[PDB]
Each structure stands twice: as C-alpha cells, then as structure tokens.
Amino acid sequence: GWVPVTKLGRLVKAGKITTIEEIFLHSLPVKEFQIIDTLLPGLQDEVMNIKPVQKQTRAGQRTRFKAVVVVGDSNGHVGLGIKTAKEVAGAIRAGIIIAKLSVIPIRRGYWGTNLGQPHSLATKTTGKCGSVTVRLIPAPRGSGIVASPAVKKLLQLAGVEDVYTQSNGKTRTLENTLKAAFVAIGNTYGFLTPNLWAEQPLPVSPLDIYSDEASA
C-alpha cells in the first residue's frame, strides 16, 4: 500500500513513533507525506491561489500553473506548499504533498496572565521572502487575527486565535507574503526565552533507539 523508503518512514509505518513532536524535537528530515498524514489526521488542506506562469518558446508560450496551498491542523502544526505543474489538478496535488512535507510547529503563547489555554504567539516574530516582510505581534484575548486574508487563513490553520500583523514591501505578491509569514511562524519555536532557558538531557534519537528493528 505504502512501502516506505526511509528509516523514519519505515519506523512511522511500524508505529514506533507515535507523534510528530518527536520528529520536530530530533529535527529528522521528512521526505514522505504519508508520515505527516499518519501523525496528524486532523490536518486541513486548502489552496491559497492559482496563478499562470508562461515561458516563451519559439512556438508560442508554454503555460503552467503555480499552486500555493497551505496545510494545517487546528492547533500547532502548519506547512506551506508551492508547486508549478502543467495541469491545475496536478499542481494542486503536488502542492498538497509539499505542504504536508514542510510542516512545522507553532509556539503559541499568552499575551498575559496565562489564565486559559495559549491564544497568541509567545514573542513578536518576523519573516522575510523577497521584499515582503511580515511581522507578527502578540494580541490580547478577543482581538482576532488582524491580517490580510492570505496570512489570516495561514494563522487560523496554524491555530492562533488573536494576533496583530504588519507587512512591509510588495504584499500583493501572495507567494512571497505567505512564505514570509511561514518563516515568521517558524521562528517562534526558535526564539529562546527564560522559560526555555533550562538545560534538557538530550534524549536518544528515535532512529538510534529503534535501529534494532531494521531488516537485518
């Protein structure tokens, strides 16, 4: 049915790894979307836009379609995929594959008082792609996702409920805007904080502990 070709893919198929947080912790390179769709079946994928790209040839223009899609489950995990293909349906499917492949976790935090569940981001963050720079700012509870529709949908699929955004540059370049916002939400788990200052024991990698269940 699947027959994976990766140590990590084979382990996920065997059920050795139960959650994607282990993959995110040990920074393993994911090359199979089946890994992501087995680790997160709550994930929702919808295309952000289709645009036609033409390449000149001595006989007319060769037209393909670039699909920008966003994959993400209601809380914590989101990826962004872009693919150019000859047919729209093929571009959409391949973009879904890439967006599942590029899934990253989101550091949700509190704007203050830490009363309920995390709603906003932990820190002000920023991403850049092309000239588009997208800056995410924590917002108080009940503020909503103050963003343009493209980045607002990405944040909704990430799982944040209330956050300010501010973009600089040619924001009309939807692909660059989405890539910048994706970088912005990716940097959240990279920003170091005093609650993250504590030193952790560095566990064995899942592949290292579970190498004994290989073919031979």
Binding site partner of 215, from RNA, another protein, none, Cβ cut-off 5-8 A by kind: none
Minimum distance, C-beta of residue 154 to another protein, in the bound complex (Å): 17
Applying CB under 7 A, does 193 fall inside the site for RNA? no
The only residue of 72, 95, 127, 138 in contact with another protein, by rule CB under 8 A: 138
Applying CB under 7 A, does 130 fall inside the site for RNA? yes
Minimum distance, C-beta of residue 117 to RNA, in the bound complex (Å): 24
The only residue of 28, 78, 97, 160 in contact with another protein, by rule CB under 8 A: 28
Is the torsion defined by CA of 156, 160, 163, 169 positive or negative?
Answer: negative
| Chain residues 89-128 in contact with another protein, contact rule CB under 8 A | 102, 104-105, 107-118, 122-124
Residue 2 has a CB neighbour count (10 Å cut-off) of: 12
Applying CB under 7 A, does 56 fall inside the site for RNA? yes
Q: Which stretch binds RNA (CB under 7 A): 12-20, 77-85, 108-116, 187-195?
A: 187-195
Residue 138 has a CB neighbour count (10 Å cut-off) of: 20
Binding site partner of 59, from another protein, RNA, none, Cβ cut-off 5-8 A by kind: none
Tell how strand 163-168 and strand 145-146 pair up: parallel
Binding site partner of 169, from another protein, RNA, none, Cβ cut-off 5-8 A by kind: RNA
Task: Tell me, letter by letter, the H, E, C secondary structure of the chain.
Answer: CCCCCCHHHHHHHHCCCCCHHHHHHHCCCCCCHHHHHHHCCCEEEEEEEEEEEEEECCCCEEEEEEEEEEEEECCCEEEEEEEEECCHHHHHHHHHHHHHHCCEECCEECCCCCCCCCCEECCCEEEEECCEEEEEEECCCCCCEECCHHHHHHHHHHCCCCEEEEEECCCCCHHHHHHHHHHHHHHHHCCCCHHHCCCCCCCCCHHHHCHHHCCC
Applying CB under 8 A, does 146 fall inside the site for another protein? no
Minimum distance, C-beta of residue 203 to RNA, in the bound complex (Å): 26
Smaller CB separation from another protein, 11 or 65: 11
Contacting residues toward RNA, per CB under 7 A: 55-57, 124-126, 128, 130-131, 133, 135, 166, 168-169, 187, 190-191
Q: Which residues bind another protein (CB under 8 A)?
A: 5-7, 21, 23-29, 31, 102, 104-105, 107-118, 122-124, 138, 186, 189-197, 199-200, 202, 204-205, 207-208, 211-212, 214
